[model samples]
Target: HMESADLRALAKHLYDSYIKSFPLTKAKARAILTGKKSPFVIYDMNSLMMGEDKIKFKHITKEVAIRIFQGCQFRSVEAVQEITEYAKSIPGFVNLDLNDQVTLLKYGVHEIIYTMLASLMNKDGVLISEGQGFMTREFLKSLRKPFGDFMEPKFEFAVKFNALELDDSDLAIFIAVIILSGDRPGLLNVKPIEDIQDNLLQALELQLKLNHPESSQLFAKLLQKMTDLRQIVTEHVQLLQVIKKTETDMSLHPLLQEIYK
Candidate 1:
């Protein structure tokens, strides 16, 4: 029978081995282990495959699952099948391609099934003891050294936009440049987003100068829309919930206070 200590040790072994093999992957892996991220958060799988490191994909998951499964003598295939079906249903895996989908389903589902069954079957405390302890140890290890820190939520708390925020000619020029760029190579990285902020402000100011005074209302609406998009990216990282919580949880750091630098 698999005990908690057994499952814990086995899971930790696979988990830690994965991190050690691709040292650079530690940031993402640690986030997963600590449950600090959403499943939708994409893993740079391409980065994983070609990383200049020793990565044993099948060995770790297989060994961990086998250990958790114990003798595998009593557990029924039906029970295992049921678990597999439910695992494939996980929102994250559901979006994956067929092969990628199966990889996770085959390993993760069975590993978990065995883990739960192990806990039930084992009379001793091996798996449970090790699993809980492993997490504690791993969590501390992740925080202290090479594994390093995860990105904290960023917020631009201060609303400092004003009439003079930008120059008119620069704003029109920037928009024209954006139109010309068209997602071409090197354009995004080379374009200084800060250098264009003044242009954006100037464009906003133009609305106030429109002939139809109520057109200013429309301009205000457009400005709000543009501001919303900016907030969506820079502050919330394109995540709405983060934006919702930003005011109380954070402040406008120097990073967002000015962009030209």
Candidate 2:
């Protein structure tokens, strides 16, 4: 029984809180990737945890690519974790059947992750990893077979999606819309979910107005981007299956594997 006003406040609260929790920003990520002030430092987690710069990469290599991919995947997992935390905070979300909640998270997480990818992407088709490693679209395409395909669709979508030039605040509520979707298959208590989605949509629209007063069509563009995200994530899944077949050394996160399964 959340009112539109109440739901909007909840969306903003969740959005703001989650962004604070995820300290990385496109600007900071770019600075890290570019070695903005000095050469970017890449350190193994173990070394960094113990206070030593055990390793660094001046350029991408096969091994560095694998390490970079691992880092990106880790952050993707973090994104899922943050969104799950936010979802639990929202009243209507917790009210859903547990199975339905799982369904939503499984199907919806990639969409959110890819949307966030747009923030990290640039027209040059370069993505900056959490470790400040640079991953170019061309480099990822050069990766061994199916592993290469894993990042291409998202890279393509990201290049185009970044053209929309959304700020973090705007991106935040849109992510909310992505997660609160009730249209995915197997949704129970659909009406309430839709109700929450509608509320998020309303909040997103209002924020869009505030953020892009001159470009009245930006909201429409964002909606289309969501459609594009769906397609990109679908192709990503097929590529993941190929990896499952061809690659044995690589270990995917259990949560990610669960989503794909």
Candidate 3:
């Protein structure tokens, strides 16, 4: 390959290698890294995988909210571990300043999770129980107060984001780019991070042009989508703080606790 190994090639190469690293595009820790392609999905007693496409509209109570939140918490812990690898694999991420790495993952992981939730979601609601159960937006809204509010912005974000019609290859690059953001406050090596982001943006633009040349605003809209992620994540963390104070029975995974802090 000549020095003309352009960022467009970077986009394709990143997608080729990155998509193999995860199941939900979130967690791919031991499976590929260690030659075990075995996939693992999580489930709780009430949220086991089911066959039907029917949506469930439970009048979620406080205790029920606690129960469900904890279930997702466990799964998110796995997601963090998985994305940790993807971030590490990004060309310059491992070379960043120490606190810089922590700050990026702390914030970026949540943003990526909310963004990719669109994969298993539609405008109506999202799949819980590891792609087993369907939880309706109507039902989520019924949870009342903070519980319902927890996922409200996410639903809105998902609907708009899903319309982008991104596939796994596109999503792999999307999340990888999400974490390289330099605007994140407290970044120790902001210049390097931004430099990486510029190259990544070049690669992504080529990818978008290749993937959606007819859609005039596709690339710009994705940048807008990142802004939407920022708002949703702010709301998400704030809601989690409310849930933390109200639900004594529910505890966050220590890993989650650190990041949210």
Candidate 4:
């Protein structure tokens, strides 16, 4: 049995250090403990219930912490597996067909995703050094800018909120997404990889024909967030509609397509 002080310390460590060390793992553990059929976590219920003030809550809730651990673990495992699979499946992926596309996947790719998820959840910046085992030391020395851009932000927000405020559930979902997707490809799904104008054009077409400006706007803002992806996002929006229309049906869904068109 732990004393109250010990519990407090444990909770703080969990909230701080542990989240970074294994974000996906924590998420997975939480789900198993809570009877979730799968490892996915729903944001609203899982993470926000804790209080910010230390005095307001004695310690992290057993339920939330449990879920966080469960969700995190599952996500991490899933990410690793999916990443490896995708790399293997991609045609010519293993061939150093280009400067960047050297093989099916680089081990460093896993570390990049890991660091990205950890930093996002923990609000901390990550540091990289050639000493890390993911890549050859010579290779590491050559790609300083690319590695720093991806990893450093992990350490930037180390002090944002008490464990309660960040919402483990939502963070878990995003991390899993980064993994399920080829990290950069996943970002591509959310918006366009490049060409905002193209994205807006597609969105506008959808809006005019279907009257659903929301979809267009969704792509638009993402484009605004990363101006380069505009064209790619717009094109994706068009492709997404094909599947979504079949499920929701343009008539029964009551979306704005008719109104705008």
TM-score of each: 0.20, 0.77, 0.77, 0.23
Quick one: best lDDT, which candidate? 3
User: Which scores greater on lDDT, model 2 or model 3?
Assistant: 3
Task: Quote the positional error of residue 185 for candidate 3 in Å.
Answer: 2.4
lDDT of 1: 0.30
RMSD of each: 25.5, 5.4, 7.2, 24.0
Better of 1 and 3 by lDDT: 3
**Pairs of residues at least 3 apart in sequence or in different chains that clash in candidate 3:** none
Task: Please write out the lDDT profile of model 3 over residues 1-261, one tens digit for every residue.
Answer: 113358667777677667755554433321222334222222222332232213332312126555455555656777787788778877788999989999999879888777767776666666654443456666666664476677677777877887887776677677878998888888877998888777777777777888888988788988888878888777777887787788676655687567534
Off by over 4 Å in 1: 1-76, 122-261
Poorest stretch of ten by lDDT in candidate 2: 52-61
Q: 3 or 4: which has the higher TM-score? A: 3
lDDT (Cα, tens digit) per residue for candidate 4, span 1-261 = 224444333333323433444424435433343345332222333213422122122212224333233233344454555445433332223342332332213323344344334333333221111111011122222223233222222233222222222234222222222222223431323222123223323422333233333344442332242222223334434643553454322232234234322
Q: For model 1, how many clashes?
A: 11
Error of 1 at 196 (Å): 34
What count of clashes does model 2 give? 0
- Would you give me the overall lDDT of model 3? 0.68
Model 4 alpha-carbon miss at residue 15, Å: 29
Clashes of each: 11, 0, 0, 45
